[PDB]
Amino acid sequence: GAFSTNVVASKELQQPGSARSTRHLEIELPKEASYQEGDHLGVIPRNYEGIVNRVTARFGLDASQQIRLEAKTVSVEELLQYVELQDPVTRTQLRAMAAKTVCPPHKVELEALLEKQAYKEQVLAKRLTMLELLEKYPACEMKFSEFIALLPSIRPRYYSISSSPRVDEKQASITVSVVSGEAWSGYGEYKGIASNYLAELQEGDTITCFISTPQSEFTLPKDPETPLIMVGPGTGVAPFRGFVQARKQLKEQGQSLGEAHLYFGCRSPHEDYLYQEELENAQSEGIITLHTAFSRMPNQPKTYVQHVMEQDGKKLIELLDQGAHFYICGDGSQMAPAVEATLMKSYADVHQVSEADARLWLQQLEEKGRYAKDVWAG
Ligand SMILES: Cc1cc2nc3c(=O)[nH]c(=O)nc-3n(C[C@H](O)[C@H](O)[C@H](O)COP(=O)(O)OP(=O)(O)OC[C@H]3O[C@@H](n4cnc5c(N)ncnc54)[C@H](O)[C@@H]3O)c2cc1C
Numbered sequence: 432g433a434f435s436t437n438v439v440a441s442k443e444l445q446q447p448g449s450a451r452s453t454r455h456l457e458i459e460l461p462k463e464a465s466y467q468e469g470d471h472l473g474v475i476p477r478n479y480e481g482i483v484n485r486v487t488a489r490f491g492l493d494a495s496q497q498i499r500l501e502a503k504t505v506s507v508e509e510l511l512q513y514v515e516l517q518d519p520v521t522r523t524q525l526r527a528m529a530a531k532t533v534c535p536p537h538k539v540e541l542e543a544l545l546e547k548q549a550y551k552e553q554v555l556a557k558r559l560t561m562l563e564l565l566e567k568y569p570a571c572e573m574k575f576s577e578f579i580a581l582l583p584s585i586r587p588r589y590y591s592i593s594s595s596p597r598v599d600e601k602q603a604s605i606t607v608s609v610v611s612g613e614a615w616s617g618y619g620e621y622k623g624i625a626s627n628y629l630a631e632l633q634e635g636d637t638i639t640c641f642i643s644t645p646q647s648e649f650t651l652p653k654d655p656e657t658p659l660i661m662v663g664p665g666t667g668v669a670p671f672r673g674f675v676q677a678r679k680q681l682k683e684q685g686q687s688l689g690e691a692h693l694y695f696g697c698r699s700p701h702e703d704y705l706y707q708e709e710l711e712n713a714q715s716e717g718i719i720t721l722h723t724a725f726s727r728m729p730n731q732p733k734t735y736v737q738h739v740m741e742q743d744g745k746k747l748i749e750l751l752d753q754g755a756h757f758y759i760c761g762d763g764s765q766m767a768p769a770v771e772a773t774l775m776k777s778y779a780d781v782h783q784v785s786e787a788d789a790r791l792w793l794q795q796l797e798e799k800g801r802y803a804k805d806v807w808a809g
Contacts, residue, residue: 432641433639435640436460436639436640437635437638438634438635438636438638439457439458439602440455441454443455444703444706445702446702446703448592448701450607451609452609453607454512454606454630455593455605456607456629457602457604458602458603458640459602460603460642461546464599465800466642467644468592468604468651468674469644469645469648470604470643470644470645470803471643471645473643474587474589474628474638476585476587476628477559477628478488478511478512478585479622479627479631482516484726485566486562486575487507489713490578494507494508498576503726504659507575510579510590512584513578515582515584516560517801518582518583519559520560523580525541525542525545525575526545527573528568529541529778530567531571531573533570533572536585541564556615557616557617558614558615559616560614563614566618571637576593586596586690587641587736587786588624588626590605590606590669591606591669591670591760592677593605593669593672594673594789595673595676597677604672605669606668607630608664608665608666608809609626610622627713641708645657647803647804649804649805651678652756653687655678655681655686655689655769657686657689657756658691658750658753659755659758660691660703660757661674661692661694661748662736662758663694664694664695664736664766665697665703665705665706665761666711667759667760667806668706669760670805672709674691674758675718675719682716690750691718692722692743692750694724694735694736696724696725696726696735697722697724698725700723700725701727713720723809724736724739735769737772737773739771740773740774741777742777745804749781750786754801756802756803757796757802758805759771759803759804759805760805760806762775762808763804764809775790775792778792802807
């Protein structure tokens with residue numbers, strides 16, 4: 432149930448000279464909103480200027496032109512804030528373009544993409560959009576009013592809140608990796624919509640957002656003495672920053688804290704060691720034990736989080752046999768499965784049991800509520 436609120440801070444987490452960006456934003460919450468560690472912020476993004484301007488150039492329109500679809504009048508530039516502009520082209524979109532195409536070979540090409548293999552390999556695997564194909568085919572006679580009606584409604588993007596409400600219940604932070612690269616479609620440079628939107632926000636800007644609690648619970652154990660193992664390289668650190676803040680307040684309120692291991696991984700401490708100072712300070716203060724893995728250090732082997740976990744396997748498996756909860760956040764496509772595989776291998780090795788037994792062990796851990804994931808694909 433979306434609300435509109437102000438940005439209180441917006442800044443760069445990576446170091447000067449990094450070729451990449453990760454943003455930290457703080458966002459104010461109204462009275463009616465609240466959150467918990469492990470919650471998500473749903474952000475309704477705006478489409479960036481460059482992509483809007485590509486649409487208006489292609490159709491020969493002024494951004495400010497007032498129009499009415501068939502029922503209020505609204506500007507072209509504002510209508511373009513309601514739709515997705517870089518989803519893969521759909522078959523309905525392709526058929527629509529083909530019907531409006533007056534150069535025969537260009538119509539053959541569009542219709543070729545409807546076929547099973549071409550669509551899979553040339554549209555979906557490359558993320559080729561309707562807009563890119565309209566730019567390739569300036570003579571395709573689709574109208575603006577038809578373009579806009581064929582597109583999907585703009586979707587929320589989700590971010591793992593990276594603060595604890597025990598610090599300030601009405602302010603939440605998020606930690607955003609800025610997606611950009613050469614477009615897989617081959618049409619210039621790609622910018623992820625919500626991450627570049629958030630990247631451009633500044634203090635004082637307004638944002639429309641909502642609190643969303645995930646289906647799979649991602650929360651601290653009830654007892655602060657229960658041990659924790661947290662694996663969150665890169666932007667996967669985000670929810671665990673929240674857990675670090677909650678533990679810090681629990682300690683300042685007199686509670687006694689158990690062991691908490693944070694496995695953090697990034698390219699280099701000279702580039703993308705997010706929240707390094709706060710995390711080094713939490714460690715000094717006994718809130719966590721920090722284990723870092725640097726993947727791109729001159730004169731050192733490439734080290735990932737799971738390589739350190741495997742060295743620490745006896746200790747991690749001992750903590751788990753004592754009741755620890757295990758948490759993975761960040762990349763779900765390659766990192767999370769490898770971290771899972773390493774944990775299970777450590778169990779098999781420590782307890783001299785088979786891999787099927789290790790998988791059943793992990794399955795039971797999940798069923799007890801002690802193996803949680805906040806992961807996403809990228
Ligand atoms: C539960 C959950 C929690 C999350 N937590 C966080 C978080 O804490 N921090 C964070 O940064 N993200 C998080 N995400 C991811 C986030 O919601 C967005 O998906 C991410 O910011 C990308 O959105 P976007 O709008 O910028 O890019 P979009 O415009 O939506 O594009 C993203 C898509 O573009 C594809 N793509 C990437 N590069 C290229 C390229 N060069 N050419 C063509 N296509 C490309 C991607 O593979 C993906 O399919 C989370 C996601 C989920 C589901």
